[PDB]
Amino acid sequence: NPEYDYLFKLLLIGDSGVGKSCLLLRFADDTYTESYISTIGVDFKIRTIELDGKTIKLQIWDTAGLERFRTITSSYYRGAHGIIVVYDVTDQESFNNVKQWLQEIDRYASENVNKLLVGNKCDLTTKKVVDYTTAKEFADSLGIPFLETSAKNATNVEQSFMTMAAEIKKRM
Amino acid sequence: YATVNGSLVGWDLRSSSNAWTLKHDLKSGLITSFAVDIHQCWLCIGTSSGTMACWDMRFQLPISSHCHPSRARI
Amino acid sequence: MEGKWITDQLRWKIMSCKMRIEQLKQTICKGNEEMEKNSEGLLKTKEKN
Amino acid sequence: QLNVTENECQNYKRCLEILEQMNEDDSEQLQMELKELALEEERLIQELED
Amino acid sequence: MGEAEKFHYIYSCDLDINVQLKIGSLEGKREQKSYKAVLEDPMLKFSGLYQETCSDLYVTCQVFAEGKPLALPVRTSYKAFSTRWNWNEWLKLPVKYPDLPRNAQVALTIWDVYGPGKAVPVGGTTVSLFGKYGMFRQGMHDLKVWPNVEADGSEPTKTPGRQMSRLAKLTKAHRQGHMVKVDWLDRLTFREIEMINESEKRSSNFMYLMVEFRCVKCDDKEYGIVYYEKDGDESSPILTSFELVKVPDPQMSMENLVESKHHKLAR
Amino acid sequence: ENGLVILVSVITSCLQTLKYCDSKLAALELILHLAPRLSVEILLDRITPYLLHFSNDSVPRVRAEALRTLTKVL
Amino acid sequence: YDTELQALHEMVQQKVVTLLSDPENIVKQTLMENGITRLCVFFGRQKANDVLLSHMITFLNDKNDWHLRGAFFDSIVGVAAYVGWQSSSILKPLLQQGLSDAEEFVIVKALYALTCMCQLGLLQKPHVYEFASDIAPFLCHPNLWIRYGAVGFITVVARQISTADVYCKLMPYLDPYITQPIIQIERKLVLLSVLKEPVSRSIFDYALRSKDITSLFRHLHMRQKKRNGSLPDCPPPEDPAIAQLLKKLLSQGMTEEEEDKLLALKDFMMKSNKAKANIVDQSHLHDSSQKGVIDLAALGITGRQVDLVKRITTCKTELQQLIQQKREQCNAERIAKQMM
Ligand SMILES: Nc1nc2c(ncn2[C@@H]2O[C@H](COP(=O)(O)OP(=O)(O)OP(=O)(O)O)[C@@H](O)[C@H]2O)c(=O)[nH]1
Numbered sequence A: 001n002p003e004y005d006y007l008f009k010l011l012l013i014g015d016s017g018v019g020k021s022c023l024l025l026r027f028a029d030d031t032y033t034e035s036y037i038s039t040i041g042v043d044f045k046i047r048t049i050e051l052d053g054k055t056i057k058l059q060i061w062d063t064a065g066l067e068r069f070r071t072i073t074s075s076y077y078r079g080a081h082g083i084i085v086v087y088d089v090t091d092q093e094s095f096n097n098v099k100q101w102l103q104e105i106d107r108y109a110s111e112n113v114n115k116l117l118v119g120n121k122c123d124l125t126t127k128k129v130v131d132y133t134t135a136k137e138f139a140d141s142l143g144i145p146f147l148e149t150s151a152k153n154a155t156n157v158e159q160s161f162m163t164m165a166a167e168i169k170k171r172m
Numbered sequence B: 001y002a003t004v005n006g007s008l009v010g011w012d013l014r015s016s017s018n019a020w021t022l023k024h025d026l027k028s029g030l031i032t033s034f035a036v037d038i039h040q041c042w043l044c045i046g047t048s049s050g051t052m053a054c055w056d057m058r059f060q061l062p063i064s065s066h067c068h069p070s071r072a073r074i
Numbered sequence C: 001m002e003g004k005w006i007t008d009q010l011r012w013k014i015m016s017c018k019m020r021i022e023q024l025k026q027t028i029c030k031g032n033e034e035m036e037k038n039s040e041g042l043l044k045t046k047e048k049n
Numbered sequence D: 001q002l003n004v005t006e007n008e009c010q011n012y013k014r015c016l017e018i019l020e021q022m023n024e025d026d027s028e029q030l031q032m033e034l035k036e037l038a039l040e041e042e043r044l045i046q047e048l049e050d
Numbered sequence E: 001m002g003e004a005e006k007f008h009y010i011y012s013c014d015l016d017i018n019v020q021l022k023i024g025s026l027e028g029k030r031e032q033k034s035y036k037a038v039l040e041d042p043m044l045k046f047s048g049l050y051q052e053t054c055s056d057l058y059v060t061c062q063v064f065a066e067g068k069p070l071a072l073p074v075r076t077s078y079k080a081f082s083t084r085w086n087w088n089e090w091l092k093l094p095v096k097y098p099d100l101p102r103n104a105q106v107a108l109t110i111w112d113v114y115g116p117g118k119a120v121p122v123g124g125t126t127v128s129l130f131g132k133y134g135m136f137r138q139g140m141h142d143l144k145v146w147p148n149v150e151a152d153g154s155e156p157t158k159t160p161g162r163q164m165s166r167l168a169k170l171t172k173a174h175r176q177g178h179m180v181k182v183d184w185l186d187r188l189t190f191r192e193i194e195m196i197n198e199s200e201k202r203s204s205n206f207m208y209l210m211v212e213f214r215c216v217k218c219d220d221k222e223y224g225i226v227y228y229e230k231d232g233d234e235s236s237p238i239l240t241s242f243e244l245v246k247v248p249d250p251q252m253s254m255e256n257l258v259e260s261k262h263h264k265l266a267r
Numbered sequence F: 001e002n003g004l005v006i007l008v009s010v011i012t013s014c015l016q017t018l019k020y021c022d023s024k025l026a027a028l029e030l031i032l033h034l035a036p037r038l039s040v041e042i043l044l045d046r047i048t049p050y051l052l053h054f055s056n057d058s059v060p061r062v063r064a065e066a067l068r069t070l071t072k073v074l
Numbered sequence G: 001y002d003t004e005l006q007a008l009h010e011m012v013q014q015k016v017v018t019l020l021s022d023p024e025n026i027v028k029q030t031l032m033e034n035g036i037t038r039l040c041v042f043f044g045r046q047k048a049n050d051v052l053l054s055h056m057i058t059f060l061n062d063k064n065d066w067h068l069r070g071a072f073f074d075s076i077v078g079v080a081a082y083v084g085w086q087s088s089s090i091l092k093p094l095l096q097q098g099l100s101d102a103e104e105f106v107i108v109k110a111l112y113a114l115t116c117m118c119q120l121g122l123l124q125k126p127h128v129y130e131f132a133s134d135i136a137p138f139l140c141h142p143n144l145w146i147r148y149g150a151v152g153f154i155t156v157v158a159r160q161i162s163t164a165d166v167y168c169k170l171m172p173y174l175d176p177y178i179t180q181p182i183i184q185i186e187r188k189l190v191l192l193s194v195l196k197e198p199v200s201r202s203i204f205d206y207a208l209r210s211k212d213i214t215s216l217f218r219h220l221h222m223r224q225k226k227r228n229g230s231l232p233d234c235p236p237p238e239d240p241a242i243a244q245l246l247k248k249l250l251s252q253g254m255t256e257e258e259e260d261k262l263l264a265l266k267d268f269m270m271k272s273n274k275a276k277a278n279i280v281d282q283s284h285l286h287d288s289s290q291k292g293v294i295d296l297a298a299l300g301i302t303g304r305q306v307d308l309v310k311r312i313t314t315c316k317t318e319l320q321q322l323i324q325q326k327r328e329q330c331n332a333e334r335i336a337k338q339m340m
């Protein structure tokens, strides 16, 4: 196809307030805002990227992290090539729930879906409670890539998606 | 069916009740015509001032209102 | 203790007052923020009307 | 029991020493601090009522 | 493509296991900090409302039927809260499914510290344990919390947990896959639901206690628990004859229990 | 309450042949409501024999309520 | 009468022991909240101690059910009052065990029980001061339930003892946790307003949760000695675990004053940490419960099924209505998904 080579469906999952929306906006629109508007249901934005000479259209999906808008069954993981599990590095409970989020991935996503643990809000160095080593050891035990991103100051947000897109491409 | 006072009412024939009612924003214009999705997912209301307003029939809430550049009746 | 008890009643009367001074102060501070908020709301609603 | 009772007497005696060694606070000096704050409270209550 | 459509269920009177209720998170704001009330009641500054943004609240779950409690209240284990109330705790209730009548409810009260040795109710919420057609509630439920009151277990409850109410259900149906997916349309529609939700957040000081009910699984099947009584299939062999026996007597061939009570007390 | 003992033997003549939990529970509610209106002679001699009966009932809710009723009646 | 009265006492006495040895804790729990103190009259002042109270004491051994341990403390005051002073010796160590519980809601219940037993004069005079010494550090506990439960005890103790004992015995214990020594601490408002800030929950949890908590306090105790001048200088931690933990604590805001409070709670935190560790060894077995799935293989119950594609009791009629709704929903979803 002349428009793109591959279309990867990326999903962003995590607790409410971790920055799943802000990471999506920082990647697709290159914008940040402090105005919190809890995601309900499902949202998606499309960014096409260059990677290893190939044209990859990324459809990144943003989901509700609030339990009020979540259910046991989850249709959103269906058809996703990669899932970003976002936790707030200043919020220990968000990191603890990554285990819960990985179980949802395991039972509802594809068997070979790609994964990525993202610790957002790394710019909040004074409030950080989850150390890079604690999360890196956790991610490495599971083999999932791990990055500490920041939607506020764009830190490492691009590379987190470039990593996912590259890993999915390595899978195809 | 749509009425002059902006209500787009869904009347169930095999009952006598309404399945739904959509109160169209008469600030937009008088409903002149409306179209329903073949998949029964969304509808669009065309008004006398050129506004065409979309409703999600699964959730029953309005989602878009694009108007004609000349505000020409639909 | 009779001598300390008398002085310690005052030490509580003073400290208790200080807590009411603090609370009543911030109550005014909050009472005055609703002034700027609702008076500004009054203005915008008068131009709007 | 004799040791416990003797220890109790030592304790009370020490505390008596502390109470007597410390100078009794001037009620007047604390009372003016209370009265100055009572004026502030009332002056403020008027402001709150307004 | 898809597993079959078979509906599996168990009778409630056949599931002899304790009911378990997950206490999830308490979303919403509390009743601010009315400093007018503190001047009137100085003990009120020494209360969870005024000491931390998230006081270490706890929930008590009690099951009621016909307005009476079926057993003692169960309390969530202590959890220190900092920025969100998320117990995430499964509570084993003292009632089993056979023990539950059709109008069993769970009265859930959120409690807070109010000075020494005194808990104040932050709110209460009551949800029936069986649905409209007698199926035990399944999965994740968000319950409306009634401020400053304990959950009411009376029949009918005055603190029922069940615009955003309708939309949330549709949103849950959408997330479960029961609603048809239309990407171009879901993207547009959920932004409006978000606007509605934010407006309701600002308009009202509502709180929701998300709870969850366990799923009964066997061999990767899902069983709903439907309310039944043992012998519920015993359609009585009623017959309309009165040829000889015009006047049926229910006590007809029955032990005289007033004579046996007497026998047991004299002899 | 002088004629109540005539109605009581209408109720108590049913109790040894009830089938459903709801009718055994309703039977228990009736006894509880009438109990304050009957003489102690009627309670101990007539109604207690039938509360100890439901205590041996097949339904645990019925057994549980029989004891609860018995306690309140006595 | 003497025979009939004793027979009735034995009948009830046997049923209470039967219920206090029930296989379900909720039965033992239920019996305690309803009338265990009222049933003490049947046992008598002596058998209530020998039988009833000994049975209740075993409830504290149940380390996997805090609700039963909490229910013991909610009802021990009635039995202890009835048994009398002969129960204070047996309950004193158990009440201290209740203050180092693995569940902080059992600590609050133990604190309350101590408060009530002090109000009733059940606590012996010297034991009142020993509990005051152990409960004082809770005045800086991050948990407000514990902190205010401690305030409940201390105010009651101050009311029970004379004003001389307040300044001469109880106040020395409270001076580290109070901003200003006020003799009116018998009032909850007075004590609550003079409390120092609690240890931060985060800092308290870091120390409490550390596996080497004993070696942490051993080191933190030496940092205090340098602060107090009892040492010329304090060497850095000798263990890499304590080094990592100490830098975690200092970076997360651990103040010099919080170190002092943490050292006051040292005894409580080491015992409490030990209790939590004991239960965790058993918690490895009970992990499937956290997952929201019930497995029927443990009972083999009659599972039932209907196909959603083709008197009368109220429950039977209602099942047919539910199955009808299920058939309609699946049909509706199928059609809806078919149009798209
Ligand atoms: N300091 C800092 N704050 C951030 C960052 N990202 C998000 N935030 C803040 O956290 C809030 C929540 O971010 P959202 O993106 O809305 O979080 P979310 O994951 O989408 O939450 P839900 O949509 O409810 O699932 C934002 O409003 C920001 O104020 C970040 O990278 N650094």
Ligand SMILES: [Mg+2]
Residues within 6 Å of the ligand: A020, A021, A022, A038, A039, A062, A063, A064
């Ligand atoms: Mg979002």
